[PDB]
Design an enzyme around this catalytic site. Structure first.
Site, PDB file in Angstrom:
ATOM      1  CE1 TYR A 113      -3.677   2.626   1.083  1.00 25.61           C
ATOM      2  CE2 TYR A 113      -1.927   3.382   2.519  1.00 25.61           C
ATOM      3  CZ  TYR A 113      -3.157   3.577   1.941  1.00 25.61           C
ATOM      4  OH  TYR A 113      -3.854   4.744   2.161  1.00 25.61           O
TER       5      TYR A 113
ATOM      6  CG  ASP B  76      -6.325  10.047   6.052  1.00 22.41           C
ATOM      7  OD1 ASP B  76      -5.802  11.064   6.529  1.00 22.41           O
ATOM      8  OD2 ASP B  76      -5.735   9.216   5.299  1.00 22.41           O
TER       9      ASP B  76
ATOM     10  CG  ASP C 143      -2.303   4.487   7.291  1.00 21.31           C
ATOM     11  OD1 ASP C 143      -2.346   5.660   7.723  1.00 21.31           O
ATOM     12  OD2 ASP C 143      -2.442   4.214   6.076  1.00 21.31           O
TER      13      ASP C 143
END
Ligand SMILES: [Cl-]
Ligand SMILES: [Cl-]
Ligand SMILES: [Mg+2]
Ligand SMILES: [Mg+2]
Lengths: 128, 129
Positions: free
Chosen positions: A16, A40, A103
């Protein structure tokens, strides 16, 4: 391709960030499952919808010059989840900046992402 | 303290790692809300309440020889949550090893840890450094 094993989680997460760094919006968006949510920065409502995950990203990565790099290894569970530290190099107030981010992702059976939460604030943002 | 802002969350989290690094197991527990929920490692069932939380930490830390250090900045939010990267050095079978961890905390309006997830596994233990 089923629920990722911890070693496999270390693989999807790190893909990713490559992808994000190479700027391939379309490749980013096949990683998300259909019901998947983006938070986010964490704190703000989940996004959701595959047109909508794709407008999110295209708003962040379109202008092609973002660079994102892991800044430590991917921590990975056995229940298809993981967390990663990284940095982003971007543009704010017309100037280059960085941003330190963490993340947390959960991967559904099909090895696709379902939740993504990104942690950062101003408190992480540095003008260069 | 009320809910914590972002700068307040960076500082609360960093103190958790010291207190871990010095091994003050009563001061750590007391960072937690009375009814807080620990998942460590995320995925094993949640450890609930200060009694249980104390038993947990004593069993990790009481043997001594654990040291813990951040490995970059705390990532805070404006909804009293955060996240931090850190490395735990310990001695197993008399061989030293390192464990890389990310904790994720959600704080209450007194500024007590309400919920702690710890992300790690066996990928993250490295027994030559
Ligand atoms: Cl790290
Ligand atoms: Cl970092
Ligand atoms: Mg210390
Ligand atoms: Mg309470």
């Amino acid at each position: 391709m089923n629920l990722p094993t911890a070693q496999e989680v270390q693989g999807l997460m790190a893909r990713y960030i490559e992808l994000v760094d190479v700027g391939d919006i379309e490749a980013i968006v096949q990683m998300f499952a259909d019901d998947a949510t983006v938070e986010d920065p964490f704190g703000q409502p989940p996004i959701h919808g595959r047109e909508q995950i794709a407008a999110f990203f295209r708003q962040g990565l379109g202008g092609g010059k973002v660079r994102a790099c892991l800044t430590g290894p991917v921590r990975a569970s056995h229940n298809g989840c993981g967390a990663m530290p990284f940095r982003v190099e971007m543009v704010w107030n017309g100037q280059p900046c960085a941003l330190d981010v963490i993340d947390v992702m959960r991967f559904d059976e099909h090895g696709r992402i379902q939740t993504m939460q990104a942690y950062w604030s101003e408190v992480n943002l540095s003008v260069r």
